């Protein structure tokens, strides 16, 4: 069993690193099943040459909406759950990670089906926050996924491989994704169907 982190806290990624370069999110987001739940996921890269202390991830849904009373909100913001409750948004960013927002009753994608997706006018804003160990200062990295950028029924290619006592990152695959069998019903719909 090859350790990921050594006893003295130095990680075993990127042989011969030194722990500006900007951080990178995947260009696309994918939606597909993980242990019977539908999930929207996007990938978030590390910083090749520095740790990010107190790193956290959050996402906003930006979407215009009209309240049952006729109030119209341009570009309304609401928070997408990417680990907030269990502390799984407190990232340990030492190699690219797939962040997953599980689509449940409280998720805004609850009723969005495959067909219905390309119709919706929305944008996921993703936001990484954390203190760069090296620099001492607080960073923020952002990115965005509009409708046409969320690929339904795909999964992220793995990029992490163990080679000679270090784990190397094939950054070429970073944005690459592949197709997999995935129902085209909405989450709400899978739930109804399952629950009888």
């Amino acid at each position: 069993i090859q350790r990921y982190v050594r006893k003295d806290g130095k990680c075993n990624v990127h042989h011969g690193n030194v722990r500006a370069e900007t951080l990178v999110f995947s260009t696309h987001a994918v939606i597909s099943m993980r242990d019977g739940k539908l999930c929207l996921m996007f990938r978030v890269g590390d910083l090749r040459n520095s740790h990010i202390v107190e790193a956290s991830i959050r996402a906003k849904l930006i979407k215009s909406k009209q309240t049952s009373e006729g109030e119209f909100i341009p570009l309304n913001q609401t928070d997408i759950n990417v680990g907030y409750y269990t502390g799984d948004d407190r990232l340990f960013l030492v190699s690219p990670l797939i962040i997953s927002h599980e689509i449940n009753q409280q998720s805004p994608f609850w009723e969005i089906s495959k067909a219905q997706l390309p119709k919706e006018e929305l944008e996921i804003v993703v936001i990484l926050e954390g203190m760069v160990e090296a620099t001492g200062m607080t960073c923020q990295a952002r990115s965005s996924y509009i409708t046409s950028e969320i690929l339904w029924g795909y999964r992220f290619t793995p990029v992490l491989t163990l080679e000679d006592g270090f784990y190397e990152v094939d950054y070429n695959s970073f944005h690459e994704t592949y197709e997999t069998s995935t129902p085209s019903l909405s989450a709400k719909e899978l739930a109804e169907l399952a629950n009888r």
Copy 2:
């Protein structure tokens, strides 16, 4: 669909910006229905020329009170819920936002009706907190809404408009508000009535 945030994280607000100027809250707060719940809301502006990382919002109710045991607390503080539980107080401040505190059983405005409002001796203190990307340092901006400053049965004028691939802010409307049909019962009261 015109993006709000570009792939590399630069937002599309305030054409030709550069991301001291002080931040601004609305002068008044409004109370009115959103999807069948009564809501107290106030607006909170952005910083025209800088992002605010790890920006959060909180509000205190300052109100003198007497405990059933006769203890009298001058200017007692209690926390107003403006997204604390779901992470909707973790703001993405890139254009003025209406913050909403939904008036539920645990809200102190639960039993405050329209008539009853101008009678109560209270003050909402609003507090924005966050690190100014530019400056590196932690900012705090505060403001206040006393009774006469909460307008019952109004809504905030929208200020956000898309113009030629950027979203511009009509800062003139920032404080402006308009009237709308709104019941004059208290939340507790609407709840009773609805629940039979």
Copy 3:
């Protein structure tokens, strides 16, 4: 109605202030009823000449204990609830505040009666944390309450008075406390008795 905080965010405490001096906790802690719940409370002062951004309060119970399996923990730590869940530990420190830990089933003082108190070998450690606006840096102030320092059946004298459009703090009363009718049963006990 004299405002506590002005529209531009400047508070109306300590006429002619300028917003080292150390922060101060009360020398004693008191235990007494507030709206039918028993409460341990201690007072925590402000900084006469500076705000404290992102100010929070927490408390630890330090008490030696033996697990049902015979493991003996010297000076075991467990967290005392002083607003953690509702965000009432996120302080707005602009005049001395009484912090209250309500003694409920999950509080370690649940079964501690008046008689039983002076028998217990314990220490409350109180810890204020926050960034000094002036200094830019993170402060921590601590203090402690051992058994003999928790006064049962008392209340904190008020210190806050409005004088000519500013609220002045009578710092003399800061530590002073007074007696009030308070049952000498433990919380667990009041609960049983009440619940029949």
Copy 4:
């Protein structure tokens, strides 16, 4: 009763201290019963010559996994509960502490028995985070526990002793541990058995 923390906030540990040296986690982790619940625990040392403000602890489980849909995640991360919900991960690090993750239904060790442990391919990554009072800057200390490093059915030797009005730390015992009667069933198993 010898105080642990004095009225003015100075702690009574390490006679003649001055409040680089690196922080230290125990080399091993132990698993054993505390008040009828099974617990994985590891020890985390203080900094002999400085306090750590806003100190927090978190742990990740790193373990490769395959989703019921065949997706294979190398070195999957999931958060281990070490006080997140009650605020017991907000440490008061003034002498080495045993951090305890109670193994319940939501813990990944739920179904891991004594026999089954040495078979599993996993790694606990532990991460201390906090601002060094002295230095002004944010620190991160990390360490790791692979399978062979978690000792089943052991307890941490105590290291804290009161000597002449100060509490001294026998740093020799810091990593030392001892054996105790402990069932070899998994938590899930003890639960079933107990619950009839």
